[PDB]
């Protein structure tokens, strides 16, 4: 249909870099669409920042801080999306489930 997000997490954006000049902060949700991420605001209706895993340079989950380094081809551009989870479990739970989905794309992409 369209909004068939495989997994969905609820995090709280953090004012680090990209969430300061563009005003991207508050309570969002990391919806993993097995290929495209969707930062939806809990107090909204339509997706807020529909990004893609192919543009995310990398994603770190330091205990509770789950930031996502983004590079070119990013809906916002070069920068980083830091955020906070419930503790050191929701971060290690969303990083392991998101690492498998992304690994299925680059691994199931194509040889060459």
């Amino acid at each position: 249909m369209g909004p068939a997000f495989k997994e969905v997490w609820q995090v709280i954006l953090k004012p680090k870099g990209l969430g300061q000049t563009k005003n991207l902060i508050g309570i969002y949700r990391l919806c993993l669409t097995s290929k495209t991420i969707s930062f939806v605001k809990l107090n909204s209706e339509a997706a807020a920042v529909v990004l893609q895993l192919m543009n995310i340079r990398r994603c770190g989950h330091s205990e509770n801080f789950f930031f996502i380094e983004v590079g070119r081809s990013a809906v916002t551009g070069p920068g980083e999306f830091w955020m906070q989870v419930d503790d050191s479990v929701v971060a290690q739970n969303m990083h392991e489930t998101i690492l498998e989905a992304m690994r299925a794309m680059s691994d199931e992409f194509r040889p060459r």
């Binding site: 895993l53 340079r57 990398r58 994603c59 330091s62 680059s106 691994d107």
Partner: peptide
């Protein structure tokens, strides 16, 4: 600083 990487990023 637990960090990870993005495999589908290509680069």
């Amino acid at each position: 600083l637990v960090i990870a990487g993005n495999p589908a990023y290509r680069s």
